[PDB]
Design a protein around this ligand. Sequence first.
Ligand SMILES: Nc1ccn([C@@H]2O[C@H](COP(=O)(O)OP(=O)(O)O)[C@@H](O)[C@H]2O)c(=O)n1
Ligand code: BEF
Ligand SMILES: [Mg+2]
Length: 505
Amino acid sequence: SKLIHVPKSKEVTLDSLLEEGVLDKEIHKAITRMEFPGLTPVQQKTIKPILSSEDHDVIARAKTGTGKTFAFLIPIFQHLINTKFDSQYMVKAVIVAPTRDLALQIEAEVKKIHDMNYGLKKYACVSLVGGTDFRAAMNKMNKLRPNIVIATPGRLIDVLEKYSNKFFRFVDYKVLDEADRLLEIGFRDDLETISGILNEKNSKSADNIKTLLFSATLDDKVQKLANNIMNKKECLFLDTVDKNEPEAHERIDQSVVISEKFANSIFAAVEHIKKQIKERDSNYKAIIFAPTVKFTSFLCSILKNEFKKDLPILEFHGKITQNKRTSLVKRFKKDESGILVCTDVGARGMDFPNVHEVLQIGVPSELANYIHRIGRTARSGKEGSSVLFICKDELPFVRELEDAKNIVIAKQEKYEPSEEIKSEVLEAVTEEPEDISDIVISLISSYRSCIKEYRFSERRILPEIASTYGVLLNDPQLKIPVSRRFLDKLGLSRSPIGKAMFEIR
RNA sequence: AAAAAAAAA
Ligand SMILES: Nc1ccn([C@@H]2O[C@H](COP(=O)(O)OP(=O)(O)O)[C@@H](O)[C@H]2O)c(=O)n1
Ligand code: BEF
Ligand SMILES: [Mg+2]
């Protein structure tokens, strides 16, 4: 399929698009009432193309915290006004996202447009997301008969394989927010299933639907991955970023804290926070990322016993009930201060206003997710910083980050923990030995799955991680007790590394 | 065992 690039011009505004006749009046009052300084560079660049009379797809790219949501959300409402008479009781646009909380966020943003103009409520919206009651959603779908659907791939398929002919038979638009992630292995087959059904069911033709791709991390390789879900002949790559320019935002003051062992990053983080609390007199809003659910829960337990007196500590990951997930996302959105301890569920898309800095103990599940992680701060013209707490074996990450992502940390700092602090932390650990083992084993699993990606040294990285088990009990010489059946189940029985991390007990 | 992702996740 045809593909054209349009790098970064004359300014565009709300009023302007009102004169050009590309945007209806009822939509103008909505964004106008929000009282923004003006349209984001990406929003100016993308809005008119999407409504173009030409049959074409788009793969826009813009840095984090730069109104990419409204950048596609506004055209939807425009197209919905331009077709209010034809098939009013049918879905005309489907938005897909990697995480549940993000899909609900995009919905909440549609609900903001509805608040800035009651005349737009006619174009109802429903979110089709896992974790929520299935029957209730369909009941809401029948009642409201929405024109906009916002879903997660899994739940969407469940609905599509049961109620396609009823609602999704006249879809005209299809949005992939965080497109790259949605085109990765594990989501690509799901998306190809979404696309195929919508195109097979579309009343006009199997190429009627136009596709919109959005993300802070994109190149031309995604067009190849998306070639199976893109129906139009021509495709427009709108980029508000130079080719070699870092995809990471420039307003982010990035730093990295290198350390001897892995466990020492925990002590480093607590020290950074403890300092940042006293230095800001509480009044501190931060997000702390971790590589594992079990280590997230563990890390949260530490910060509770350490900082619960000063700030609230919020645990956030996939093993938390969806009710609680939604609940805490709401709170942290309006909370002036607090520590959000989370996995990579909160890496992409999620918008928490005025978060001072982003912390990272370890590495993300994806190289690209580093750009998305620090992207949680410095949003909407705001400022922010980011600390990366790693050890002396995770440098290939920082290196590979420089090679590929074209991102290097300006501020490098070494760290070694004092003795007085280890006592403070290692005393505040209610976890039993058997439980601690599960926390470590999970980190080993985690860090092995990204040795190829991050160019780690399986030889020296894996033993260093597993050695944390000794540290947490204050016995470095000690190893993790495990049966010969499990050790062999890992496959490390063939490697010398196996004996360097475990003990057959 | 390992981050996401459907009413068995
Ligand atoms: N023209 C605009 C667009 C968005 N925003 C704000 O930017 C916040 C988040 O932007 P976003 O998450 O949609 O942008 P991305 O991070 O997806 O690129 C929103 O809550 C809006 O309030 C704005 O101030 N002005
Ligand atoms: F949604 Be963007 F990546 F902050
Ligand atoms: Mg976004």
